[PDB]
Each structure stands twice: as C-alpha cells, then as structure tokens.
Paper text:
As part of an ongoing project to characterize commensal bacteria in the microbiome that inhabit the human gut, the structure of C11 peptidase, PmC11, from Parabacteroides merdae was determined using the Joint Center for Structural Genomics (JCSG)4 HTP structural biology pipeline. The crystal structure of PmC11 now provides three-dimensional information for a member of the clostripain C11 family of cysteine peptidases. The substrate specificity of PmC11 is Arg/Lys and the crystal structure revealed an acidic pocket for specific binding of such basic substrates.
A single cleavage was observed in the polypeptide chain at Lys147, where both ends of the cleavage site are fully visible and well ordered in the electron density. The two ends of the cleavage site are remarkably well ordered in the crystal structure and displaced from one another by 19.5 Å. Moreover, the C-terminal side of the cleavage site resides near the catalytic dyad with Ala148 being 4.5 and 5.7 Å from His133 and Cys179, respectively. Consequently, it appears feasible that the helix attached to Lys147 (α3) could be responsible for steric autoinhibition of PmC11 when Lys147 is covalently bonded to Ala148. His133 and Cys179 were found at locations structurally homologous to the caspase catalytic dyad, and other clan CD structures, at the C termini of strands β5 and β6, respectively. The PmC11 structure reveals that the catalytic dyad forms part of a large acidic pocket, consistent with a binding site for a basic substrate. Asp177 is located near the catalytic cysteine and is conserved throughout the C11 family, suggesting it is the primary S1 binding site residue.
Residue numbers in the entry:
A (entry chain B): 148 to 375
B (entry chain A): 24 to 147
The structure:
Amino acid sequence: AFGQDGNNWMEIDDLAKGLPDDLFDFILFDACYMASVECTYELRNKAEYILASPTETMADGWPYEEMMPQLFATDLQLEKVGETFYNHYLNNTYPYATVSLTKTSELDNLKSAIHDILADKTESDIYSLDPKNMQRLEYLYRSPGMLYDFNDYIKQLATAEQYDRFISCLDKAVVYKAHTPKSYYAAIGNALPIKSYCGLTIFVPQESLPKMLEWYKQRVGWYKAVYE
Amino acid sequence: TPEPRTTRTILVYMMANNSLNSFASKNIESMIEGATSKNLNGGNLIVYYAPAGSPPELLRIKEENGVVKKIHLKDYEKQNSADPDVMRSVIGEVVSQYPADSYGLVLWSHGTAWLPSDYQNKLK
C-alpha cells in the first residue's frame, strides 16, 4: 500500500486510479518499499521513470536541498538524483539506503520475459524454493518474509536461456541502482546486509501465506500478467 | 488565471497524517533551502501538505527578494488525501494553474509496496 491518511491507505490499484495516464515524466517515491516490480508495472502508464527504494528509507527521507537543482535542471538526469540520495546516506550517521530507477517503457518487454518463465509454474514449483537461498528485502512487523530480490527469485526458476533473456530485459528496465552495505528495518530495530541486489523486489509466494497469494491474484495486475 | 507555461512543474504530495508528521516539516525546510531562483531554473515547486493536526494546504515554494518562502495557495477542508479522487483533483488543480512542458511527482508517505494495508490479517 502507499499513503496513510489516518486509518486510510491507498492500495496499489487505488494509487494507479489516483494518477492521470501519461502526464508525469517521473514519480519519485519518498516512501519505503515502492521499488517493487509489481508496483512499477501497475504504474507503468503513469510515468516514464519511477525513482524509488526497494527497502526502507530513514525518516529524514530524501535530501531535497541537494537534489533541488538536479530535479529542475534543463537536462534532467534522474540517475543523478538517485546518486545524490545514495551518496547522502552513504555519508550519514545511519548509512542505510537503497535506490533504483525504472524505465517504464521497458516493462512490457520485462513482463514478457517473466511470463515466459512463470506462466507454466505450479504451486509445487514455487513452494519448493527455500527462501534462505534468496535475498530478503522486507522485514515488516510479524512478516515471515514476503518481498525478495527480483533477480534472486527468477534465477531460482529460470532455465539458463530464460535467465539470459531476463537479464537483458532487466538491464533495459532498471537503468540505475545503488545500495549501501546494509539496509535498516524499523520493525527489527536493526540493519541487515544486502548480498544480492537488482533494485526491485518481488513477492515470493509461500505455502504459509495462502491469503496473501489470493489477494495478490485479485488485486495486483502483475499476477495475471506473468502467472497466467 | 494560470501561470505562464514553464519548463517544469514538480508537485510534492505529502501524506503526513500518520507517524511521519514530525518529519514532514524537516523535509519541507530542506526543500526551502534548495529552492532558490537559480536552482528552480524557472520551474514551479508546489507542495500539497496533509499533516496530522490540521487540514491540508497547498503551498508554492519560491524565492523573492533573496529569501525562499512558503507561499500559501489554499487551505482545504478536512479530506481523505488517500482517496484517489482527492489525489486526482489536487493534481488537476496544480497542473491547471502551473502548466509546464514536463511534470514530476514526488509521492511522500509510508509505503509497503503492493501489500494490502490489512496484511497483518493475511499471515496465517
């Protein structure tokens, strides 16, 4: 979800409804967890570029003072803005930050590469994966671990040929990424290492989370796009 | 009475009626430090600010006489900033009054990717 107003939140499909099509050049999420392949896909017609963090961001947020001339530059380069964010946190008391820049025009091709891997996969195939072999990128309160590194998940399921195609498409879509050595998670009060990093998270369906999968099927466009 | 079309308008949509309330003000002050005439490069910096203890407001951040100011554009009545209709309406007001060749959106709030807001109830 995105955006808390009292008790009310925007679900990812509601956020897509709150945004006009093909108006914004970019959306910058100063918010945790928004560099999610599903979220970027849901918002693919809402911007040309999505600049966001796949993990949590410190409360101080993005370095607006330093970013300002970059955001308003005649030759806007969002990779520079992302680098300003990263370099700020790298040199901060709490050096914990992840960032990625997604080029939405390349998401349809990436979807096809992922569809060709996941559409024939069964619950048995997916539930056979051991989460311990993939980089976890989310530690929400009471979560058993739902969001993992996108590359790590796909690498576990793809044939070598499929994987090569995926990497070619991934590199066209994720045009810039950076991470500090560790990422900090509020619910655990600790920072944990990032050993594998592509810039985007994905849901890893697990046998203990059938209700989460049912909701994802019904409400997250990516599911029907790549699993069916 | 729209402003002359400029090179860029950026809208910062701040949903801060939550635990980030205290940090929204710090982020706005950071924007004020950066938003000089030279740095804005003719562009518009507009902020929709929805904090905890008061109704939302629309602000323009712009330098005048050597000082970057928060200029009050309007006060909204109490409204759900997470309602997509409200977001669309604010975006429309901003784009209409501050036309540009290019637009950017900063979405500022809590986030949990695609997860349902009631995810804690879907863990068993």
